[PDB]
Each structure stands twice: as structure tokens, then as C-alpha cells.
Design a protein around this ligand. Structure first.
Ligand SMILES: [K+]
Ligand SMILES: [K+]
Ligand SMILES: [K+]
Ligand SMILES: [K+]
Lengths: 90, 90, 90, 90
């Protein structure tokens, strides 16, 4: 469960990294950071797409990616972080 | 279920596209992108309303639109993406 | 239920409007718009607090306000928007 | 329950305060404010990391912190705010 969502999240972030590095000219690290900041809905806006291709991709990436990323966050919190916290209390 | 939320999401995004293109002077593609970035709560701020009409509309659009857009995202994730993922594992 | 959350949301937004208009010098309409953009987690950043008082208030306002605003949005979506949609289908 | 999430949220925010004050050169109050604005997903972008260290930390901080912060917000809303509201109605 967690492993599948972890792998899917990595793949989704790799896709954004490649897209934004190529089409929007970002350094790969900036493209990865931007992809994370986007799909977690933080949205600083220090980076944002300038091209119409980038804007269209971003629309679709948000709709397809938010569900996966927040599914991963939920499983991380409930199946990894929560048991680790409980274990520390004993 | 999914079809109804899909159609409602398209209609909601068309409404924002028309509003922001007219009142805020955005290109239609920018107005659509801004509407998506708003209702998914990303909020880059590369675009934001400059007129009081735009600010008032945005308040109401957020309150009326977030529930529909995140209902659609939830149904997309659970009723489309999840079964597709499970099918790939077999 | 819905009425109580509606009133609480209005009161919470009035509080932010008064605070940001006074301490951060915003026009009341801008303060209301900023309060909404904050508590719905959109966060354009076209407005943001410049004073330390404003930053401290914003921290506490977010933590106390997000739960109320998203409780209201949930009740709006499920108890008002959903039945209205279903009624249109018949 | 609430106490544990409260303490964990404080610890998580202290960690961000120390990190962003040191690596990104922010005043401690700005680092705390930025940490809150990040983990609640508001993301104004008035502050954002400029260094690659800061961007990498921010990616990991978001993934590890969102679950804790929104767990705390949920418990605050349902176990503290809700009973206080109900008590006011009698
Ligand atoms: K945001
Ligand atoms: K958000
Ligand atoms: K934002
Ligand atoms: K922003």
C-alpha cells in the first residue's frame, strides 16, 4: 500500500521534474521543488509556468497529481508516522 | 457520479474563465489556468484580481467552487485512478 | 448546523477584516479578501502581513480559522450544493 | 491525543524556525511564520527558500509536516472548538 503510493509519488515528481526543466527551463532541482510545492498545494509562486504549454500541463498535473500526493501523505501519516509516535510513548 | 462532477467542474471553470477574461482582462488561457490554480488552493499569485469586482467574485468563487473541485478530485482518485492502478498490478 | 457554521465564518472573517485593516493598513475590502484567501489556504501573496504583530496574528488566525472555514465549506457542499444538484436532475 | 499533537506541532515548528533562520538567514519570527504558512499549505511566497539546501529541506519538511499539522488542526477543531461552540449554545 504505502510502497505503491511511494513509488507512484516518485514517478509523478520525476515527470514534473522533466517537464518543467525542459519546457520551462528550470534547473532540475528547481523543477522538482516546484512540482512538490504545486502538488501539495503550497504554491509559493517563486516559480510558476510562463509558457502556455506549461500552464496547460500544470492544470492537468494538478488534477492528476493531488490525489496521489495526498493519498501518499495520508498513508505516511497514518501507517508510518502514527505507529512511530506510539512506539516512542512506550 | 463521476460524470456529473466532471461536467460541473468544467462548467465552474468555464465560468471563471469568462469572468476573469472579461473583468480582469486576462487572456482566456490565463483565466482558465488562474481559475484552476485558485479552486485547487495552489494560489501561485502570478495572477490575482486587481479590481474590487474581481476580489468579491473571487471570495464567492472560492467558497462555491472548492467543494465541487475537491469532490471531483476525490472521485477521480478513488473511482478512476485507483482501479487503473490496481489493474496494472495484474 | 449550517447556520451556526455560516455565522461563525462571517464572524471569523469580520475579525480578520478589522485586524488587517487596522494593523496592516489594508482597505476593508482588501482585508476581507485577504482573510478569505488565507483561511481557504489559497494564499496568493498579493497581500501578506508586513508587521510582526500581523505575522503573529496570522499564525494564530490560520490555526483557529481553517477548521471553521473548511467545516463550513464541507457543510455547504454536502448539505446545500449536493441536494440542489440532485434536485436539478429531476 | 490533543496534547501529543500539540507538542509535536510545536516541535515541528521549532525545527523549521531553526532551519530557516540558519540556512535561509531569516529572522526567527519570520522563520516561524514561514514554517506555519508552509505546513498549513497557505504558501504566500513572501518568503521562500533561495538555497538548494533550503529547497531540499522544504520538500521533506512539507511531506513530513503536513500530516502532523493537519492532524492537529482536525483535533483542535473537533475536540476543542466544537465542544466550546456547543457549550455557548446553552
Ligand atoms: K496555497
Ligand atoms: K492549499
Ligand atoms: K499560495
Ligand atoms: K503565492
Amino acid at each position: 500500500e504505502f510502497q505503491v503510493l511511494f513509488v507512484l509519488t516518485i514517478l509523478t515528481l520525476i515527470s514534473g521534474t522533466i517537464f518543467y526543466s525542459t519546457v520551462e527551463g528550470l534547473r532540475p532541482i528547481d523543477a522538482l521543488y516546484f512540482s512538490v510545492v504545486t502538488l501539495t498545494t503550497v504554491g509559493y509562486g517563486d516559480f510558476s509556468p510562463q509558457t502556455d504549454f506549461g500552464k496547460i500541463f500544470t492544470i492537468l498535473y494538478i488534477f492528476i497529481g493531488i490525489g496521489l500526493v495526498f493519498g501518499f501523505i495520508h498513508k505516511l501519516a497514518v501507517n508510518v508516522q502514527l505507529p512511530s509516535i506510539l512506539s516512542n510513548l512506550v
